[PDB]
Amino acid sequence: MEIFKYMEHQDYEQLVICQDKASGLKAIIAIHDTTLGPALGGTRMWTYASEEEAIEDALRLARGMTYKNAAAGLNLGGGKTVIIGNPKTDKNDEMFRAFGRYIEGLNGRYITAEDVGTTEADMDLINLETDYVTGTSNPSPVTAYGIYYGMKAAAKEAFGDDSLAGKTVAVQGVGNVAYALCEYLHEEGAKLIITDINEEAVQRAVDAFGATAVGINEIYSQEADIFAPCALGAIINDETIPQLKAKVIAGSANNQLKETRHGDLIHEMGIVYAPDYVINSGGVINVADELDGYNRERALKRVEGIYDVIGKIFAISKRDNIPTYVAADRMAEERIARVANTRSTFLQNEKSVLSR
Amino acid sequence: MEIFKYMEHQDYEQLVICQDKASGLKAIIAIHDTTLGPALGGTRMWTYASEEEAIEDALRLARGMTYKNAAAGLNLGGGKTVIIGNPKTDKNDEMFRAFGRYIEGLNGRYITAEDVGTTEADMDLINLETDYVTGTSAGANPSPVTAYGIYYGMKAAAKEAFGDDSLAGKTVAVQGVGNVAYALCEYLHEEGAKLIITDINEEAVQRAVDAFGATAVGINEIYSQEADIFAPCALGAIINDETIPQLKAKVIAGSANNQLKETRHGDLIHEMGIVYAPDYVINSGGVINVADELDGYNRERALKRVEGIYDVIGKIFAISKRDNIPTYVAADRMAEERIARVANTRSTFLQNEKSVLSR
Amino acid sequence: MEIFKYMEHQDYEQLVICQDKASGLKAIIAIHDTTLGPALGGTRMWTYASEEEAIEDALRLARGMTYKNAAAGLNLGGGKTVIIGNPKTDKNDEMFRAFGRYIEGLNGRYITAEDVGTTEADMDLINLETDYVTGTSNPSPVTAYGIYYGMKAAAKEAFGDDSLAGKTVAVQGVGNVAYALCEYLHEEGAKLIITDINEEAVQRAVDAFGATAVGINEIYSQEADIFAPCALGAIINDETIPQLKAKVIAGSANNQLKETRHGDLIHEMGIVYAPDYVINSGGVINVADELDGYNRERALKRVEGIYDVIGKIFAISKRDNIPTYVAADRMAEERIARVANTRSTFLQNEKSVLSR
Amino acid sequence: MEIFKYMEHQDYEQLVICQDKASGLKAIIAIHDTTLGPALGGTRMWTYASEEEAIEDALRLARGMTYKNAAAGLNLGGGKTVIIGNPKTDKNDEMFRAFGRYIEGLNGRYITAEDVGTTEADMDLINLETDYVTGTSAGANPSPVTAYGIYYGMKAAAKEAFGDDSLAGKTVAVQGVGNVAYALCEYLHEEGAKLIITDINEEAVQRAVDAFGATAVGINEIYSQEADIFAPCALGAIINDETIPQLKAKVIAGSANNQLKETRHGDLIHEMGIVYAPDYVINSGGVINVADELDGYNRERALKRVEGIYDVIGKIFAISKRDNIPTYVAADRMAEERIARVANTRSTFLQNEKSVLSR
Amino acid sequence: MEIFKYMEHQDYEQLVICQDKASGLKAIIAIHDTTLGPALGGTRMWTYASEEEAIEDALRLARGMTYKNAAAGLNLGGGKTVIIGNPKTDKNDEMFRAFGRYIEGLNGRYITAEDVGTTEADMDLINLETDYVTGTSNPSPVTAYGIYYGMKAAAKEAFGDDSLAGKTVAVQGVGNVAYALCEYLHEEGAKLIITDINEEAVQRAVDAFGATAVGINEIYSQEADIFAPCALGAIINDETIPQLKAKVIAGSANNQLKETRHGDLIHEMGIVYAPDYVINSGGVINVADELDGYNRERALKRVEGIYDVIGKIFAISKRDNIPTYVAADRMAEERIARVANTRSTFLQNEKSVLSR
């Protein structure tokens, strides 16, 4: 690929390709933007059909973080690390120690964490060589508590009232996070229409929340006020758009829109869409709270702030008259700009997530 | 190209690609080996026909620096920075500032300096964002230091080809009369040696003949002349099939890089019994000099330190006939062995190891 | 002796002979290797028939630590201190303060702890002059919890299943550690065949775990799946090899093999042997956890990692086809090598057990 | 040998034995006493017939240094390093680097320098791993400093043997015309004194006669000559039964170590009324000079500081006739008493005591 | 007085006379010895009939601390501060702030605390200007727990057994400390014969411990194994010596001997006397534990060490054949000497109660 062309087009800061023959390590640390502070983002360990495919994927995810972190109201930039290899086989201690030294050598310009392929055990190895890492020492309820309020924000929007008590939610998927979100939607008093490929899990829920099991492909039109995509992505497409009976789409899943088009138009139908990478922010917020001494309680409390940011998102659409998925991208760019401006006044030692 | 495949082959540590849209900065920092310490190598700013072409050039160059720095007896690893752009038009304050920030970012793993298309004015801008740079206008006229460097290396060349260090009298043919070339002459004339030069610049050749009472000769009549020492000090590859034949100068010791055009040529001169001071080692007084700025620059100390090139060249001759191999191969083997030897020695535990960065 | 010849033969780093006339102190700090970090190892206080006998013993134990610590996955080198004297008589405060100053003068190249002869009270005196000490401020259950999992690792090896529940264990000796190991082997549901010279202790166990007392010399052939040598060493010899009915040998005792031969051959019989100095690692691991602020819980959790290392040991044998006691020595050398290589990349301030 | 028994007798603090297989480093660092402060003593690199033989030599030497440093009025304890190996063949970069690491390890308890078989080039390698070393090429021509040291000590010798410090005129017989010897002559000639020399090297003796208008004499005709001052500046034991008889020079003040071959000889010259400036104290300007590098080297300050040897020698004469004992015994008693006196004085509590290591 | 003559005679280090006109402060900080470390000792605020009377008293108490602290096994020297004034009237904030600055100016050579006249409230004011102070942020049980073990040490001495359970103790005085000591002597199972000028307090005890009230002057001969002087001092004199039926004298009171003679002779009668300033050490030990972050538990545990030191005291008498009150003075001088010697080896940064 044309690395420099790709980078220049969106002004990527760095591409730090790291290598260690003996441990077989091959990592690609992409740093898109560091305006708001150190670039933070997890390291994905997967197999890639080509070198420069992993490169582009690393760059693409880095740029995704600068937006997510920005919108989440965090003081962190956008980075991401891709480690070429099969997480299930070719993993070893030295490989992560090596990666850790290299992170130590970027002296805080990058901060890592887990992502698909890497685990809390890997982060511990890294932490042996550097402090610029998170996801060490369950994170599910936290991000779960995040969708909860984001959904609240969707409610007051679509039902002029953030109270979900009473309403029915069509929950697609019942994994740890989806499961947790249910508990919240439950103890507040609401009906759930769970589903999932794993029968066994559809149990735990029905039994615990008195929920009704429904056909995996029937979950799209159920008699519910809100639809919570918490399974795979792209579930919001041409097939599902019509079906949808719910007034709101608020879920934990990534890449909820198969095409931009899908977004452009659900916005026509007057469906209330809480942009995916923002509503599920609770996840990154939570790992950032470790940088200043992890504290579940505070973490759980800050995640609750997605309510406002989601609101800010609706406020942007009702301004440039653009769909929420577009209001998100714009809200981050605006914050990054506003903060950069505010912090241009001289100081001998400004603060940052790294300041003790 | 397959970067990861190229890096793993010779085990390159990192390739830090830095970009800045607003200033048009396209920088490739290649870190080959940091075993002896931070990677030090200048930044070559030039125009490249292809992206992968500059990345290949940076990697190849970084690994070159890890052999030089190591052979030179310095405690620095191998790195190099390649900036793609036309040095005569594209330069602008911001691009170097940006560069310096990223270097600050590598927190001491990489240290920069001058190179093709780069200047100390360039080094001063970088210095506004980081200390990890050398060859600033406040630190390191260097030409004479490196010149005093080959001078001693050449003396080391003798006592091997003449059994004596006394270049006193003996004739030396010098290709090119540039800054370094000129200073090399000064040291030679002084010890009372016969100098025969050449160089495209008539005035340069002129100032030389008058200054040292030289014997000006033609661009081509330099490879061949009646002198017991050949000092190629202009361009490389000057030791090829067209020049090897008509030389017969017991010694070769110059300031030019890549003197041998092919590994074969070295394999030959070796057989022909010509003592050759491997180029990148005899002319290391250049990197040694910039290295001296890290611990507070002192020219007088750089000069006395560059004298060490003598003891080192002679060490290569020792290795040359230890495994009986041409001097260009003994050079590379010595470098490799000092790294492993030093790495071994420093594996003993300490709480605050010393580095060229220690205050 | 030929100190230098002995040291050069195995590349010992230092022999720091320390002396203080008034307090009568005579200590010998041996530091074998510090590649993985500071040399850590306890100080043994005993009476020696000769100076240079204590010297060799100090050197031998130091080299033993570099292997134990290495295999334990710790970032510590190998050292050891021998104090010539009768622990029961000639002990005094100044003597340990003096030793402490000298340790302070090696500035972290050596870290000490208790060993036979020295106590938690001695470590406190040392700690008065330096921070490079551990075993200050019960350690038994911790190392006990270590054999537990190591034994688990032996199980899955010999019975294709790490679950010990059901199986019977022939426990030789019933001291604090052996006693603790029993509790684990008990609450998981297994039968125990305890024994020991101290009748009184054979009680506590039988009563608490419903175990059967057996003749001290009968403990070697009992109808049990696993044999846990937790008494003295060399219990695995020509006499005991045959007798052995158990499929596995996993215990807390040191020097479990009287001769190398014994090992070479039990490996023939297909007996599963968890190398002694590795399975009982829980002990040193535990004291190392003080260096970063002691925490019993974490300690107890890290000790649980002996399961993997023991496994790695079996994996080495099934590779060079060598007995476990040999697979151990080789696994440490390999780790020391691999780590040394990984950490050769320059950094202005790499981490170490001493970094705050 | 019984190391622990030897150490306890004179209460030695430590014996740090360091080894490195790859470089063949066999180092014995003996720390005798660190009461006045870090132990300072150079490393003697030599070949020894037996291991216990070198360990004995290091211990004996370290305790020597704790008397010298103390008598010299310096704030340093006694140490010494003995490296076993042939200085002419066995040296190699790695062994010294390794040495320096271990010294860094002793964190300031031991400070090294030059000695038999060691050089400042050696000291520069060590300096790459630690600051706890002196006599580097960047710090401490020393010969004249120590020479200016005995010069003042000799002046102190007078005013005791002649009631006056004015060596002006008086004759001095100098055994040996080495670097230090030569500089001792310069100070003497200058104050207008008569110089009579000798030394195996005819040219050295020659440069001396012409330079100072000396009076060259034979190797054996130096112990005996018509001079009121004998300056043994070559080898020791030069004050024995074969030379004591035919001397009659009111004073003895030289640069040579172990001037008395036996304690008896000192007991005699004392009785014979010859004023003797105890060797290791008059020639301490050597250790004083290297000591001055710790607080940022300054030759001019070392020189004015070495002048203190005068005030100290005269202090020995005071003790000499305070307990009425030969000057060689008063020297050892003064050293011992300054340590106890200083130790007592510094027992008062402070949060950050001053040391030669303070910045 | 002849200040310098007084100081030189016992080698006093300093006499720091501090003054502040406005706040009316007049303090005299005496520092006898700092060999073992910073001089620690409380500040006594009282009215003095003459300047140089307060001076001598300050010097005398300083020298007393160097002995108490020494014998207590602490790493503290001997100092003391006397503030001329009536604690009940002429006290004010500035006065103690001023004193505090001056202590800050001795940079750790002196550390203060409360003594008669000064309170925990005064220490707080001082602490506003310096960290070199203790007795800030009940101390009674702690020092009470100190006499307890000291008495234990007296028991094993006089009754060949440190167990006091059973024995009867004649407790003179029933203040906070005496009261606490009782609880210990009680829960271990022993009979008490309390007394005191304050009837009301003789109650609390009798009622709580089932003790027998006795005549204030009858407390000296009661049928008891041990006599615990916990009231005023000099209670051990010509009148009381004979009377004494108890085999041991162990109490909290200061200056328990009216004359040296009294000591010289009770040692004849074979009475076991636990030197006062040592057995009641628990008090200073406790305040020293604040210097490293106060912790009641540890404090209470270290105080328990008086058992050994008291023992060491008996061991000295049985050596030079001198009474305990003399064995004390000698044990401190010996420790100060031994420690000074041990710590003469060079170190760039030795430890001290002030090191973090």
Sign of CA dihedral A188, A190, A194, A199: positive
Subunit contact E35:D351, Cβ cutoff 8 A: no
CB B184, CB B255: distance < 8 Å: yes
Which of D349, D353, D355 would best serve as a mutation to test chain E binding (most E beta carbons within 10 A)?
D349
Separation of alpha carbons A327 and A313, rounded Å: 5
E347 touches chain D (CB under 8 A): yes
Subunit contact A94:C342, Cβ cutoff 8 A: yes
* Closest to C152 in 3D by CA, of C26, C274, C15, C7: C274
Q: Which residues of chain B are within 8 Å of residue D128 when distances are taken between CB atoms? A: 75, 354
Q: Which residues of chain C are within 8 Å of residue A27 when distances are taken between CB atoms? A: none
Subunit contact C11:D19, Cβ cutoff 8 A: yes
Scan residues 289-308 of A and list those with Cβ closer than 8 Å to C.
none
Say which of E38, E39, E346 has its CB closest to residue D37: E346
CB A306, CB A153: distance < 8 Å: yes
Subunit contact C342:A102, Cβ cutoff 8 A: no
Sign of CA dihedral B327, B330, B332, B335: negative
Q: In Å, how far from its chain's centre is CA A252?
A: 8
* Closest to B339 in 3D by CA, of D199, D94, E327: D94
DSSP string, C149-170: HHHHHHHHHHSS----TEEEEE
Separation of alpha carbons E266 and E322, rounded Å: 11
Chains that touch A (3 or more CB pairs under 8 A): B, C
* Closest to A41 in 3D by CA, of A10, A81, A91, A101: A81
Scan residues 57-96 of A and list those with Cβ closer than 8 Å to B.
84
Domain range list for chain E: 1-66+77-133+330-356, 134-329
Q: Tokens 């020698």 identify what position? A: D313
Closest D-chain CA to E348:
D108
Nearest Cα of chain A lies from the Cα of C342 at a distance, in angstroms, of: 6
D49 touches chain C (CB under 8 A): no
Separation of alpha carbons D288 and A290, rounded Å: 55
Q: What resolution (Å)?
A: 2.5
Which residues partner with A82 through β-bridges? A28, A44
Separation of alpha carbons B13 and B7, rounded Å: 7
The alpha-helical segments, DSSP class H, found in E196-259 are 199-205, 240-243
C176 in a known ligand binding site = yes
Give the count of Cβ contacts less than 8 A between chain C and E: 34
**CA A74 to each of CA A65, A354, E85: distance values in angstroms, whole numbers, following the listed order:** 11, 13, 60
Contacting residues for B233 by C-beta, under 8 A, at least 6 apart: B150, B174, B175, B176, B178, B180, B181, B184, B254, B255, B256
C105 touches chain D (CB under 8 A): yes
Phi, psi of D56 (to 5 degrees): -70, -40
E351 touches chain C (CB under 8 A): yes
Residue A77 DSSP SS3: strand
Contacting residues for C168 by C-beta, under 8 A, at least 6 apart: C190, C191, C192, C193, C222, C223, C224, C225, C226
The alpha-helical segments, DSSP class H, found in E80-197 are 93-104, 120-126, 140-158, 176-187
CB C75, CB C30: distance < 8 Å: no
Separation of alpha carbons C57 and C115, rounded Å: 13
Phi, psi of A208 (to 5 degrees): -75, -35
Separation of alpha carbons E16 and E18, rounded Å: 6
Say which of D8, D16, D84 has its CB closest to residue C14: D16
Contacting residues for B279 by C-beta, under 8 A, at least 6 apart: B236, B254, B256, B257, B258, B259, B260
Catalytic residues of C: 80
Strand order in D169-175's β-sheet?
A: D193-196, D169-175, D229-232, D251-252, D275-276
Residue E341 DSSP SS3: helix
Closest C-chain CA to B12:
C345
Q: CA B47, B50, B53 angle in degrees (round to 5)?
A: 90
Separation of alpha carbons A130 and A121, rounded Å: 15
Subunit contact D16:C17, Cβ cutoff 8 A: yes
Subunit contact C14:D102, Cβ cutoff 8 A: yes
Subunit contact C345:B108, Cβ cutoff 8 A: no
Which fold is adopted by the domain B1-66+77-133+333-359? Rossmann fold (3.40.50)
* Closest to B349 in 3D by CA, of E24, E36, C32, A138: C32
CB C317, CB C327: distance < 8 Å: yes
D180-202 per-residue burial string, b: 16 or more CB within 10 A, e: under 16: bbbbbbbbbbeeebbbbbbbeee
Q: Which residues of chain C are within 8 Å of residue A98 when distances are taken between CB atoms? A: 342, 345
Q: Which residues of chain A are within 8 Å of residue B19 when distances are taken between CB atoms? A: 4, 7-8, 11-14
Annotated catalytic residue, options D80, D170, D194, D250:
D80
Residue B132 DSSP SS3: coil
Nearest Cα of chain B lies from the Cα of D25 at a distance, in angstroms, of: 11
D124 touches chain B (CB under 8 A): no
Q: Tokens 């202090």 identify what position? A: D315
Q: Which residues of chain C are within 8 Å of residue A19 when distances are taken between CB atoms? A: none
Separation of alpha carbons E172 and E218, rounded Å: 10
Question: What H or E segment, with its residue span, contains residue C191?
Answer: strand C190-192
C177 in a known ligand binding site = yes
Separation of alpha carbons D254 and D178, rounded Å: 12
CB D111, CB D65: distance < 8 Å: no
Other Cβ atoms within 10 Å of D271 Cβ, number: 9
D29-68 per-residue burial string, b: 16 or more CB within 10 A, e: under 16: bbbbbbbbbbbbbbbbbbebeebbebbbbbbebbbbbbbb
As to burial, measured by CB atoms within 10 angstroms (0-12 exposed, 13-18 middle, 19+ buried), residue A207 is exposed
Phi, psi of D130 (to 5 degrees): -170, 155
Structure tokens at B93: 């304050």
First to last CA, chain E: 41
Question: What H or E segment, with its residue span, contains residue A81?
Answer: strand A77-84
Separation of alpha carbons E292 and E297, rounded Å: 13
CB E229, CB E256: distance < 8 Å: yes
Indicate contact of E with C: 3+ CB pairs under 8 A: yes
The CATH architecture one would assign to domain D134-332 is 3-Layer(aba) Sandwich (3.40)
Question: What H or E segment, with its residue span, contains residue A341?
Answer: helix A324-342
C349 in a known ligand binding site = no
* Multiple choice CATH, C1-66+77-133+330-356, 3.40.50.1010, 3.40.1280.10, 3.40.50.10860, 3.30.420.40: 3.40.50.10860
* Closest to D113 in 3D by CA, of D147, D149, D142, D73: D142
Give the count of Cβ contacts less than 8 A between chain D and E: 44
* Closest to B186 in 3D by CA, of B198, B174, B200: B174
Subunit contact A17:B17, Cβ cutoff 8 A: yes
D24 touches chain B (CB under 8 A): no
Are C1-66+77-133+330-356 and C134-329 in the same CATH fold? yes
Known catalytic residue at E80:
yes
Separation of alpha carbons D6 and D28, rounded Å: 15
Other Cβ atoms within 10 Å of E120 Cβ, number: 12
C342 touches chain B (CB under 8 A): no
E356 touches chain D (CB under 8 A): no
Structure tokens at D307: 């002048």
Structure tokens at A312: 């800010």
As to burial, measured by CB atoms within 10 angstroms (0-12 exposed, 13-18 middle, 19+ buried), residue A162 is middle
* Closest to C217 in 3D by CA, of C199, C203, C235, C234: C235
Q: Tokens 């919890």 identify what position? A: C145
Say which of C342, C350, C351 has its CB closest to residue A98: C342
The CATH architecture one would assign to domain A134-329 is 3-Layer(aba) Sandwich (3.40)
Subunit contact A17:B11, Cβ cutoff 8 A: no
Separation of alpha carbons D117 and D132, rounded Å: 19
Closest B-chain CA to C343:
B35
DSSP string, E125-153: HHTTT-S-B-S----HHHHHHHHHHHHHH
Contacting residues for D212 by C-beta, under 8 A, at least 6 apart: D185, D186, D188, D189, D195
Q: In Å, how far from its chain's centre is CA B87?
A: 21
